[PDB]
């Protein structure tokens, strides 16, 4: 059982190989460009129909509808432009930790402590939202679900594995078992040929949906990773964690570019997202407010303080026109 | 101005009032988290009250609707989903009295109770504590001294004394003794008195919550 020494040797080799490439920090390169300045964002709309704390949300690809999941056993779909509720789906189990709204808009997904990713069919005859399928097979609570298309879906449960499902058949086609802790987040690249999962072992990973192999592993955190989001370019991502530290990794350099932290911030991060161009970096905190980090200068650019509790979820539309932040306050504001 | 959106707003208001009605119906319910150690007496108390990640148990006693969430079926880190249960009315903790000389296991239950009795989320959620298997305690005290588990136990090896000592040891574990109660009951298998004790404790917790809402407390 000496192969542990070999594993340590390859770890040291990886450290030296990704240390040689560190020509200059991104902050050194970016110090020459002008900062974005203070950014004012105001609550254009507030969506108040949830009676319990909200644990997730997701925008449609039309950037107008959004689905929000709370612990009151409801999965409401809002028309953000006019605040109307389009649907109000009663859930099988009121213990829900995630939701996903399909790219085509036909389906919605929802999971939680019941270890089941139950997907709902919106655009159907009979005018009611009917459970299309109940994907079972995870042995732990689901933490995030994302639709590849109307056909497939990738989940990330607390059994330290991510899986890829075939909705029509209902059976897993690929399973990703490389983590050692609960997989608390998941994010699909814009081309949906590879995704990243943030675990509680303080290490993200770069998976391949086609094969099922972890291409790269990105360590560097000191606590559990609660959120993750690809850069819009698709060649980088930023991870939130419990140590009040958000840092931007890079797939091509296989390292961490910088870190977004401040001494006055000691509250962990529950959600991370990018602006449409990727210059900004929204990040929700337990401190009840969001912070608009400058993704290239590491400086702040604003605060989104309108919630009375942890902002558990946060999302930027596909056209970049708005930022929706849902909190345990049971209100889901929409900034701009 | 709102040409066809009038009917959309009407549908929104209708499903809004449906949401409000369902929320009131759910607020009528009273929820009880259930915990315990391995192969404890939790299944026993579930069977007493007649009613695959978590198992929810619904039962009604004296015009009160209880929901019971058995969560011990999740093999994941407890620190990540334990904030989902903030706001639960009480906690039903099961401890087996017959497991003081098995593997240590009593110390495991004690450390679990300590870890989830001083929790940041359950800082005011009063704990209802059960102590199953009194008959096995009677059987085993006469032959296995309580000094096996508690080496400092200086007292008689009678069932009443040992049971009171264990109850006091468990109730000693709440640091904020002036914030949350720890109701204790030795699970009896007759006349469904266990659900009566649960009802009394839940009524006390409801009274305390009403006092806090009214501002008197």
């Amino acid at each position: 059982d000496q192969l542990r020494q070999e594993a340590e040797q390859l770890k040291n080799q990886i450290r030296d190989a990704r240390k040689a490439c560190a020509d200059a920090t991104l902050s050194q390169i970016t110090n020459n460009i002008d900062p974005v300045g203070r950014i004012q964002m105001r609550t254009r709309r507030t969506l108040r129909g949830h009676l319990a704390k909200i644990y997730a949300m997701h925008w449609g690809t039309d950037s107008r509808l959004l689905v929000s999941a709370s612990q009151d056993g409801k999965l409401i779909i809002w028309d953000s432009y006019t605040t109307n509720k389009v649907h109000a789906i009663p859930l099988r189990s009121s213990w829900v930790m995630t939701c996903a709204y399909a790219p085509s808009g036909n389906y919605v997904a929802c999971g939680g402590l019941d270890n089941i990713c139950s997907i709902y069919n919106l655009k159907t005859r009979e005018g009611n939202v009917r459970v299309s399928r109940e994907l079972a097979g995870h042995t732990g609570y689901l933490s995030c679900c994302r639709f590849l298309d109307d056909n497939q879906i990738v989940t990330s449960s607390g059994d330290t594995t991510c899986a890829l499902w075939d909705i029509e058949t209902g059976q897993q086609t690929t399973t990703f078992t490389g983590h050692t802790g609960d997989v608390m987040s998941l994010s699909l690249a814009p081309d949906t040929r590879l995704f990243v999962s943030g675990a509680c072992d303080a290490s993200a990973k770069l998976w391949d949906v086609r094969e099922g192999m972890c291409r790269q592993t990105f360590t560097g955190h000191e606590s559990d990773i609660n959120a993750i989001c690809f850069f819009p370019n698709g060649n980088a991502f930023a991870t939130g964690s419990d140590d009040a530290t958000c840092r931007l990794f890079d797939l091509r350099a296989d390292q961490e570019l910088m870190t977004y932290s401040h001494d006055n911030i000691i509250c962990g991060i529950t959600s991370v997202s990018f602006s449409k161009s990727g210059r900004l970096l929204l990040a929700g905190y337990d401190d009840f407010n969001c912070n608009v980090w400058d993704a290239l200068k590491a400086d702040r650019a604003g605060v989104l303080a309108g919630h009375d509790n942890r902002v558990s979820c946060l999302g930027v539309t596909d056209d970049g026109m708005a930022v929706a932040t849902g909190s345990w306050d049971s209100f889901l504001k929409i900034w701009n | 101005l709102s040409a066809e959106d009038k009917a959309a707003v009407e549908r929104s208001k209708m499903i809004d009032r449906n949401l409000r009605e369902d929320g009131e119906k759910a607020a009528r319910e009273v929820k009880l988290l259930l915990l315990g150690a391995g192969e404890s007496g939790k299944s026993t108390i579930v069977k007493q009250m007649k009613i695959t990640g978590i198992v929810e148990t619904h039962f009604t006693f004296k015009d009160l609707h209880f929901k019971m969430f058995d969560v011990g079926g999740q093999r994941s880190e407890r620190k990540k989903w334990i904030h989902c249960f903030e706001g639960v009315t009480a906690i039903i903790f099961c401890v087996a009295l017959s497991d003081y000389d098995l593997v240590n296991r009593m110390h495991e239950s004690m450390k679990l109770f300590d870890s989830i009795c001083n929790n940041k989320w359950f800082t005011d959620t009063s704990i209802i504590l059960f102590l199953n298997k009194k008959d096995l305690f009677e059987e085993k005290i006469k032959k296995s001294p309580l000094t096996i588990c508690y080496p400092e136990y200086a007292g008689s090896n009678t069932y009443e004394e040992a049971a009171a000592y264990i109850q006091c040891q468990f109730e000693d574990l709440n640091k904020r003794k002036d914030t949350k109660e720890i109701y204790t009951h030795f699970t009896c298998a007759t006349d469904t008195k266990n659900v009566q004790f649960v009802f009394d404790a839940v009524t006390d917790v409801i009274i305390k919550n009403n006092l806090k809402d009214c501002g008197l407390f």
Partner: single-chain antibody, 232 residues
Framework: VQLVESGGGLVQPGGSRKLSCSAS????????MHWVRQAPEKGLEWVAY????????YYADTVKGRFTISRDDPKNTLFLQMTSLRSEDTAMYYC??????????????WGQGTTLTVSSSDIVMTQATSSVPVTPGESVSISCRSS???????????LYWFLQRPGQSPQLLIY???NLASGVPDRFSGSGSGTAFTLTISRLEAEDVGVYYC?????????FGAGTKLEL
């Protein structure tokens, strides 16, 4: 889904008669329901409407007050109660499903309709080409000319296109002037701006010849068109 009819038959004018539309196959309590009638010598005409939950009721001016529309949600049945009928009310009454939310497709399903006979600020649309003969495969255009700007502030031009096969209830082809209905072949297409609309059919074939109707939904009372008729 399914919508049936009951309550027809010859009626002495000045009397009363009730039409029942019992729906079986969909969540009836979530759909608003309309009554639409078609005179033997004329085209479709709006009559009445109930929202979901009976929170809003509208009537056409020609039947306002005399008629009464009501629904029984637990029984899944829709009632039209007509009092003091006249000879102009002889028609065939369809029972139309309609659900209103963002992205919905109202007027999608039409009942089979009953054939009651009686013995003895309104946006007007015109369809100049009352009829035209064609052959399969030809690309044919049907034009609708409104009288008020149907393009609302929110950019949604409220105009619907229906097709009535010979001896059949009409079916929704296009809703809001551009979106195809569920099940309609992608050869149909709609375009145009306010007060100028067009329905384009490519590679036309048989079993697609009928009367094409043009409706608005900008404001009640809902108004149909005369109806361009296709033939082989």
């Amino acid at each position: 889904v399914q919508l049936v009819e009951s309550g027809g038959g010859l009626v002495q004018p000045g009397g009363s008669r009730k039409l029942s539309c019992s729906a079986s196959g969909f969540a009836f309590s979530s759909f608003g329901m309309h009554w639409v009638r078609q005179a033997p010598e004329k085209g479709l005409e709006w009559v009445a409407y109930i929202s979901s939950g009976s929170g809003t009721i509208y009537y056409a001016d020609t039947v306002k007050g005399r008629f009464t529309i009501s629904r029984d949600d637990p029984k899944n049945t829709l009632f039209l109660q007509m009092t003091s009928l006249r000879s102009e009310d002889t028609a065939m009454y369809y029972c139309v499903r309609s659900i209103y939310y963002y992205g919905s497709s109202p007027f999608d399903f039409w009942g089979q309709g009953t054939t009651l006979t009686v013995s003895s600020s309104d946006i007007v649309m015109t369809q100049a080409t009352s009829s035209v003969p064609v052959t399969p495969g030809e690309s044919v255009s049907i034009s609708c000319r409104s009288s008020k700007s149907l393009l609302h502030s929110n950019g949604n031009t409220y105009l619907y296109w229906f097709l009535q096969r010979p001896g059949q209830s009409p079916q929704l082809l296009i809703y809001r002037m551009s979106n195809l209905a569920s099940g309609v072949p992608d050869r149909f297409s709609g375009s145009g701006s306010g007060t100028a609309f067009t329905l384009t059919i490519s590679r036309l074939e048989a079993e697609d010849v009928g009367v094409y109707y043009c409706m608005q939904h900008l404001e009640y009372p809902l108004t149909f068109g005369a109806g361009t008729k296709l033939e082989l």
